[PDB]
Amino acid sequence: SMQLNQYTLKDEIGKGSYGVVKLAYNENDNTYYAMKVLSKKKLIRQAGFPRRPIQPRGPIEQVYQEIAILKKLDHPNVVKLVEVLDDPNEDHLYMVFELVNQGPVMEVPTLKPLSEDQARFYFQDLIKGIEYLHYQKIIHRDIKPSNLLVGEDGHIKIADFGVSNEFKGSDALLSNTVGTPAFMAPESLSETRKIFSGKALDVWAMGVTLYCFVFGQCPFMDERIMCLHSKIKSQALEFPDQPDIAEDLKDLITRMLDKNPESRIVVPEIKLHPWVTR
Ligand SMILES: CNC(=O)c1ccccc1Nc1nc(Nc2ccc(N3CCOCC3)cc2OC)ncc1Cl
Ligand SMILES: [Cl-]
Ligand SMILES: [N+]
């Protein structure tokens, strides 16, 4: 192990493009937390070498976005940021989260999808979490199974706010394509620069997520980003023969994955859907 301020850093629980996640025991409150360790130089370098004398939110700015956003949130279905250790003289940046003990609900693809009942239970948490974020005027933009952490209590917490957008008024008005390709809504994948609303992007990703829950793979898939984007825009939704799923679940998924955001089901409607109300 190693000591970092009041934390004893132990088992490594995750490693990804961002940085590493360690189990951390806090000696002052005798509680365990997840500590994410990042290098600032590495995040900067990950953007690519700066060009000599539209540009995306670089990786370091995604990290700082996440900090700024999580400081203002408090909901049981959203991961809590507990502390940030950021010395201007150190390269390392440390983000301490509450421990969500079972880790991501699913790696996609999987041969072991969730049962309908487990899918519903987690989906209920997802709805509550997203309804809260939208109420707080945040569009998540990276909803997917791997960003949904299952706690010791069996409930989901939403993570990964790096490409999120805040808005004023009723909705975000967005023109940039960010997040995870398989989960990006068709209206964000237009040839010509267009403006699209934010909340509906999150509903679409929720739909892809719920399809993943019960089927273990995305409804639209291709190893090539550009062909994937084309399938998201042009392919009609299909369900496999097996596993058979309830008609009310197929209806919900169909309505979340309406390609036209004007008619796509909204969260108040999802909360009323028969599959959700059991
Ligand atoms: C967005 N995804 C993440 O933040 C993330 C990805 C991979 C691993 C961990 C991880 N982040 C957390 N992970 C946890 N908790 C985990 C996660 C995975 C694990 N694994 C331990 C080994 O068996 C599989 C589960 C344990 C754990 O706490 C004991 N708590 C909070 C956060 Cl923020
Ligand atoms: Cl995923
Ligand atoms: N996170």
Swiss-Prot record:
Autophosphorylated and phosphorylated by PKA. Each isoform may show a different pattern of phosphorylation. GO terms for cellular component: cytosol; neuron projection; nucleoplasm. It comes from the Eukaryota. ATP binds at residues 13-21, 36. One of its GO terms (biological process) is protein phosphorylation. The active site is at residue 142. GO terms for molecular function: ATP binding; calcium ion binding; calcium/calmodulin-dependent protein kinase activity; calmodulin binding; protein serine kinase activity; protein serine/threonine kinase activity; protein tyrosine kinase activity. Ubiquitously expressed with higher levels in the brain. Intermediate levels are detected in spleen, prostate, thyroid and leukocytes. The lowest level is in lung. The keyword Zinc does not apply. It is found in: Nucleus; Cytoplasm; Cell projection, Neuron projection. Interacts with calmodulin. The autoinhibitory domain overlaps with the calmodulin binding region and may be involved in intrasteric autoinhibition. The RP domain (arginine/proline-rich) is involved in the recognition of CAMKI and CAMK4 as substrates. Belongs to the protein kinase superfamily. Ser/Thr protein kinase family. Calcium/calmodulin-dependent protein kinase belonging to a proposed calcium-triggered signaling cascade involved in a number of cellular processes. Isoform 1, isoform 2 and isoform 3 phosphorylate CAMK1 and CAMK4. Isoform 3 phosphorylates CAMK1D. Isoform 4, isoform 5 and isoform 6 lacking part of the calmodulin-binding domain are inactive. Efficiently phosphorylates 5'-AMP-activated protein kinase (AMPK) trimer, including that consisting of PRKAA1, PRKAB1 and PRKAG1. This phosphorylation is stimulated in response to Ca(2+) signals. Seems to be involved in hippocampal activation of CREB1. This is Calcium/calmodulin-dependent protein kinase kinase 2. The gene is CAMKK2.
